[PDB]
Amino acid sequence: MDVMNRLILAMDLMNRDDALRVTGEVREYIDTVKIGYPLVLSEGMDIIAEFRKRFGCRIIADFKVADIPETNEKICRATFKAGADAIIVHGFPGADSVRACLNVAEEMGREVFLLTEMSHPGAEMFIQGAADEIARMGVDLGVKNYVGPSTRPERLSRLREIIGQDSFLISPGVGAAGGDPGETLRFADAIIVGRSIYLADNPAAAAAGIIESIKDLL
Amino acid sequence: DVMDVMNRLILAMDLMNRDDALRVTGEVREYIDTVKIGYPLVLSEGMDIIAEFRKRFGCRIIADFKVADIPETNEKICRATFKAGADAIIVHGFPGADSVRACLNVAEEMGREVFLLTEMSHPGAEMFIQGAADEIARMGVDLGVKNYVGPSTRPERLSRLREIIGQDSFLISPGVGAAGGDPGETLRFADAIIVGRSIYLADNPAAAAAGIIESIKDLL
Numbered sequence: 001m002d003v004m005n006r007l008i009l010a011m012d013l014m015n016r017d018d019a020l021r022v023t024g025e026v027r028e029y030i031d032t033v034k035i036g037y038p039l040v041l042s043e044g045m046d047i048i049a050e051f052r053k054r055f056g057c058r059i060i061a062d063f064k065v066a067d068i069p070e071t072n073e074k075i076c077r078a079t080f081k082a083g084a085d086a087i088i089v090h091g092f093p094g095a096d097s098v099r100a101c102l103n104v105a106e107e108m109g110r111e112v113f114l115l116t117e118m119s120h121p122g123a124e125m126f127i128q129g130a131a132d133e134i135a136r137m138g139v140d141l142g143v144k145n146y147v148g149p150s151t152r153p154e155r156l157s158r159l160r161e162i163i164g165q166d167s168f169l170i171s172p173g174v175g176a177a178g179g180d181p182g183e184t185l186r187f188a189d190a191i192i193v194g195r196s197i198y199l200a201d202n203p204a205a206a207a208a209g210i211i212e213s214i215k216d217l218l
Numbered sequence: 219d220v221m222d223v224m225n226r227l228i229l230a231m232d233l234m235n236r237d238d239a240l241r242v243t244g245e246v247r248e249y250i251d252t253v254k255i256g257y258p259l260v261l262s263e264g265m266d267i268i269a270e271f272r273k274r275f276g277c278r279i280i281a282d283f284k285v286a287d288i289p290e291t292n293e294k295i296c297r298a299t300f301k302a303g304a305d306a307i308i309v310h311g312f313p314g315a316d317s318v319r320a321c322l323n324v325a326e327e328m329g330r331e332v333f334l335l336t337e338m339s340h341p342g343a344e345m346f347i348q349g350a351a352d353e354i355a356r357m358g359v360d361l362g363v364k365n366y367v368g369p370s371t372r373p374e375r376l377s378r379l380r381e382i383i384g385q386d387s388f389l390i391s392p393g394v395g396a397a398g399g400d401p402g403e404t405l406r407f408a409d410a411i412i413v414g415r416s417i418y419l420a421d422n423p424a425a426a427a428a429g430i431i432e433s434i435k436d437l438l
């Protein structure tokens with residue numbers, strides 16, 4: 001996957017007018033948008049097609065898929081029917097649940113991103129201790145796309161070690177949560193950035209500023 | 219003081235089109251007053267499907283969204299879900315205490331309820347969730363969680379989770395029917411059973427629900 005400026009916008013605004021306006025303001029800097037449940041549950045799954053119509057961007061559905069295999073299959077089918085290019089799936093619920101997602105993605109020409117370790121403080125309680133094994137499980141399953149935490153660069157580096165240089169790795173927790181753009185890009189192919197852009201007084205300048213700070217990495 | 223689930227039976231409405239979902243739910247309405255609506259239906263028909271269910275049926279709505287994000291995103295998901303009319307939302311515990319607390323705080327503010335999913339019922343649950351489940355449940359108790367989800371497919375695990383949360387907590391349990399869990403055995407520990415495919419894929423969903431209820435008649 002080829003992400004413009006190695007920057008993915010996490011569009012977690014919850015109303016259509018603001019979400020479309022802010023995305024429009026930063027469109028020159030990105031071609032990939034992560035859309036999650038905050039926006040989808042507020043405005044409907046049709047918002048995905050609207051983003052494609054307006055911006056032609058790729059859409060990653062950040063749905064943290066975390067159900068039984070049968071339900072995971074249904075969630076992936078509904079999500080890809082809505083036009084998402086990719087979906088984010090938790091690894092914690094185990095291999096069968098991930099495989100269910102991989103199957104639908106293959107069937108519909110999409111990608112699965114496996115979330116291995118999360119970026120927030122609570123991730124330390126249960127997820128972190130399982131994360132390397134979850135990543136090895138991804139490798140065993142043939143997963144090629146991964147998500148890991150900007151907030152713990154040593155953990156992000158370990159994830160990169162496990163999956164190898166050929167796999168694709170994206171990383172949230174940049175900006176608001178404390179992660180540094182440049183350091184994160186030592187290991188991740190692309191950074192995910194939400195609040196630092198969409199809550200900024202001037203989202204375009206915020207995006208431009210981040211990109212300037214990583215100019216030599218592009 | 220817990221929700222009063224008619225016949226101790228919660229329908230898992232995982233059909234993905236409005237017409238079928240509405241037909242089947244209507245067909246079993248005399249047997250249930252509590253419906254679990256998840257992402258298969260919501261991502262297919264929109265959050266307004268909750269509105270349509272409330273209009274059509276006298277049913278409480280549990281939004282089975284297995285919320286599993288960072289605290290800030292969890293808060294937004296819970297707000298949107300309660301705004302749409304869900305009575306309760308199901309949240310994963312494995313992302314940790316801050317993520318669960320975020321959901322509890324919104325539920326308290328908005329006058330609604332959180333269910334904490336501890337151990338899951340499918341085979342893959344053995345890989346990572348099972349080993350964390352007793353602690354996830356204990357964490358829930360420490361956080362003041364009153365409502366829980368645990369697996370009918372592993373009676374020994376469901377029994378242990380009931381012990382951890384205590385007799386006063388409310389416990390609901392999926393994996394009944396299609397996945398092999400027995401209604402009666404499950405109700406030894408759970409307050410209510412969740413049933414999806416055994417009912418919604420039946421040629422006669424009403425007969426299927428009645429049959430399940432007949433099999434647990436002495437437990438009502």
Ligand SMILES: O=c1cc(O)n([C@@H]2O[C@H](COP(=O)(O)O)[C@@H](O)[C@H]2O)c(=O)[nH]1
Pocket residue numbers: 010012036062115117118119120147148149172173174175176177192193194195196287288291
């Ligand atoms: O470990 C993770 C995984 C995520 O998907 N995310 C998601 O990435 C985004 C981060 O946004 P922000 O830059 O505002 O912190 C949010 O949409 C969040 O749900 C995360 O923060 N940490």
Ligand SMILES: O=c1cc(O)n([C@@H]2O[C@H](COP(=O)(O)O)[C@@H](O)[C@H]2O)c(=O)[nH]1
Pocket residue numbers: 067068071230232256282335337338339340367368369392393394395396397412413414415416
């Ligand atoms: O551990 C769990 C937790 C669940 O919420 N579920 C949910 O409960 C329902 C079970 O439906 P069924 O009776 O068709 O197996 C599904 O909606 C599923 O997503 C589960 O099966 N196992």
